[model samples]
Target: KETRDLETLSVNAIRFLAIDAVEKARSGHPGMPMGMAPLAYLLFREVMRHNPLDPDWPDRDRFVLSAGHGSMLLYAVLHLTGYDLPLEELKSFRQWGSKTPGHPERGHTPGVEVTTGPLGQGISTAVGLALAERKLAAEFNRPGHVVVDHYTYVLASDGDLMEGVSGEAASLAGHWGLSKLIVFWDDNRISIDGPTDLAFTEDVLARYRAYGWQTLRVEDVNDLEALRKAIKLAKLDERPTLIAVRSHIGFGSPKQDSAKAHGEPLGPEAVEATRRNLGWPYPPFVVPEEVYRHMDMREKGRAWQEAWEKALEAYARAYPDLHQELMRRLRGELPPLPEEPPSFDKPIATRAASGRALNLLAPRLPELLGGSADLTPSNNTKAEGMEDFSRANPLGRYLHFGVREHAMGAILNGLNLHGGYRAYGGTFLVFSDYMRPAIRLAALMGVPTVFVFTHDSIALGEDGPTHQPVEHLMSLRAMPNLFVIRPADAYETFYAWLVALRRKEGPTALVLTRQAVPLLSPEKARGLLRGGYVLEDVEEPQGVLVATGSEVHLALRAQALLREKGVRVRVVSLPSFELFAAQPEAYRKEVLPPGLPVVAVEAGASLGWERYAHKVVALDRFGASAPYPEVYERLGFTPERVAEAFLSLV
Candidate 1:
């Protein structure tokens, strides 16, 4: 609605705000933000379809800053474009309790989509954002109803591309033909170690084309016409596009195009020189009144929302049931599962049990969406009638994430963040390391995505030490806010699924065993959700034997062996450590009882068990290459060893 005069005023204002904020905080990546301000201004001011006031509007375009170190750029534009980000917040960048954390955090910062800064995660998660839009549109959009329609934009840096996770995600983005996804590469040619060529010399542009992504280029970001034209061309393409926009590091500063401008603040003298060079006559922390008025987007945002609402209303009138279900899913309210548990009373692997639980929910909870990382059969992730989600079949419920486990992790975050879906994905427990960064961010952002890790312990014996997870249990449990549920048997596996689905505050890991075990009676297994319960209690127990997953049954066996020889012991099944910790002090004490020496049994690292048990019968070393029975017994997972350990501990 305005001319190029205000455009100049707005872009420079964003740059100066970024410069001052970083210098004021005396900490931040000022250069990239300063350089990227023009593009940020363009997205917020002209190209994007969104409501600045209502940042969560369903159909609004999504923006992700994959290069999150340049957080000031995002903060500045968000404030300027009339989001809830105030000027005071910008001044408080990276300070304790400020909305502006050094790296953009989701849910903490308004309008921030996914938590980024670990590089490769933001753009990878945005792939899920684009997938969500495509899937929803495929499912709900009729010829006359275009409810789910929006683009996903990411501002990535050379750092994001350097990480392997982004390429893994990009391969899928191209493979699936995610047409509405657009990424603008901030090719400033500098990294923390000086020029990018020092370590990166690949032709990144050709790589994208080889991955089937459309590519475009703009030599200078300030060339508004060229940038706008490139954007238009990107939008018209049927595949994801990467627009490589060449920019100067620290743009107008004396350190321009230098690595010195990448992280630390521009010195006072350099800052003034940059201010003078850029012709910004304002003092630090000052914004011209006219700039704010011109950049204010409330009116434009309102128009966009109102127009979408009108379309939504018409679509609702024509399809009331569809409209109702979509809204309910948007609110993230799950229909109550049946009170009685589904029929499951056989000796079966928990992985197979998990497949049953998934199918049980598929018909009832349409929000369920997931699959495996090329380990579909081994992981037992696919449910009945759930076809694989692909470019040819977006309406299908299942996902085939190929061999990229890390992408599945990041995309799961993206799917959950976009709303209307409860996304879960599966892989071997050992491979959890491949996507630890994505999982870490999931916990940090508190997104509700279920991660299914099968072959939890050394039960998949033939794969030996490398494939078996000896430390993953403690490693994943170490992350705060992430619930790790290592279910015991078929009976407990259903409850694990229930807990994972009900948890909306944070993420959950459903760790299942690869081997078969006797199923416990439902009446006694009801305490599975309690996290830990006395499966077999003695009149006056001499000690308690606690275990998780397949080892729980072994604990009960050990207790039986001890009782046969006139020794008394109790068996407690501890499924989820995180959930058990959340129990009341009285409840926790009631289950374990103080001074009752506890022996813990597991087929993994013994670390951290000391908090709950006096002695731990765990495999502290790498598992030996053998059959399941031989491995279990030879590795000291025998009932005799557990019983003897318990008897000696007391």
Candidate 2:
């Protein structure tokens, strides 16, 4: 029974560390941590195959705590298990510049697999992780080499289940049949507003079963044997697992299971009483010597690493070429680019250009993977000969994500987190509002995921203004760390694809048009790389005209009209503000040129142009639900109207 006693002490150590950190911060949710400590301890020590010292190990299992308000629980486990976090960082939890922040940040911390704070995002990311594992294993593993098989485990709470994003993601996970995924529901029945019964009373286990998961039960939170048995049963099942573990918010405290112990820290009286009730403790933050030795002994992480090493050696002996390829993918190496990108001499839509480029890029880069939200034909994301990623066949490069845009974004983030794949997804630009949260999370995590948005503006034509994106360009530019590129022509679209592929940090959205845009010969505007560059210049500039996307064509036309009327007009193409803002002051001055009447024209909102131009001839009002030409005519976005506006400015 010495093993049993040691397990109990280690579990209690996790509980006390969580409690101490919450109390020390004077802020944070302590209830879920206190109640779910045993469940976390049992899984980490037995079921999960993680090497804390080498958290980036390719085949290592993933653990996500969806109830991020209880971040201290994860911090406690990571610290005690020897992941890079020390006790001092734990002591400085939630303090300025501390490693332990309010929420778990993926790249900021050693063991954090995904940045999670918003409820439901972590669990959704877990679903994505499972999907990635299946695809990688199928592609790399031969009969004798089982290289990439690992489970994705998540700990979630009622809050995660309540979010609408979780509902959408769960539906997709169930439809995909991710059998290697498992989640633990911390059924503490307490929310900050009071008992969850007041707000949430759904049958959670029944719902999981309905969602096509194998459901299990652990009636007692402290029952380690029962929890372990349930986990093993889950692995044996052919569907995702959800274990409903009944727990108390504060099991041993004087205010046990009450709302008082849910969010805020317990007072000194309750803290002291809880410590005494759990058993003798020297003081806060002080664990017994036996507990440290017991927990630290699990640094068998290196041993597990050695085992994987042996497996790799054996796999190499069997299939040398495949073994080397798998190692290269695991090391996140991209193959060399093709000698030349595919192209068409005639004018073509940017979306069509992107599709052709993707087909060309696929042969050179095997890791390039993406899908569309039921808009494959229109978005042009499907490469020829690529298989669809499905439950029955996980080796496909294309994903049929159905109509779920939000989950598609979150799933792409998870794929990047899993490492070994260059993840991308596509949809129309108008629907970006539906997936903004996931895009924001991608930016926050700094993952190199590409988002291909087609039909960028009223150029969608017969679809009318209702389906067009009038304000999308301005609103998307508002998000930090997100690069928005509107290529002027087909050749520029090629360059945009190159930039998106090479970007190592944050996310990039390639905005493409539906209608054919004429290819402008690249000349004075080589500085389009700096965001805005002079496409055409006048001998003596009486006025300046700047535009982007379809409007660049209009600006050029307007410049011709202005010149006929004895007005000198310079034409500028401002494709991306984020990229241009990054240019030095000298470049900005040369392209924009100070002390000139600058006018910006676009079939979109007038916002986000004050930085480069003085007066903007832009659509400041909502677009009409009519034909494209009619809408432009009514909005005064034509060459004549733009020329008139320029003449007024001059």
Q: Each model's TM-score, in the order given?
A: 0.99, 0.96
Relative to the true structure, how large is the alpha-carbon lDDT of every model?
0.91, 0.83
Instruction: Give candidate 1's error at residue 374 in angstroms.
Output: 0.3
TM-score of 1: 0.99
RMSD to the true structure for each prediction, in A, is: 1.2, 2.0
Q: Model 2 off-target regions past 4 Å?
A: 316-318, 339-341, 462-466, 522-528
- Best TM-score among the predictions, by candidate number: 1
- Which residue pairs show backbone clashes in model 2? none
Best by lDDT: 1
Residue 452 miss distance in model 1 (angstroms): 0.3
What's the distance in Å from true for residue 609, model 1? Answer: 0.4
RMSD from true fold, candidate 2: 2.0
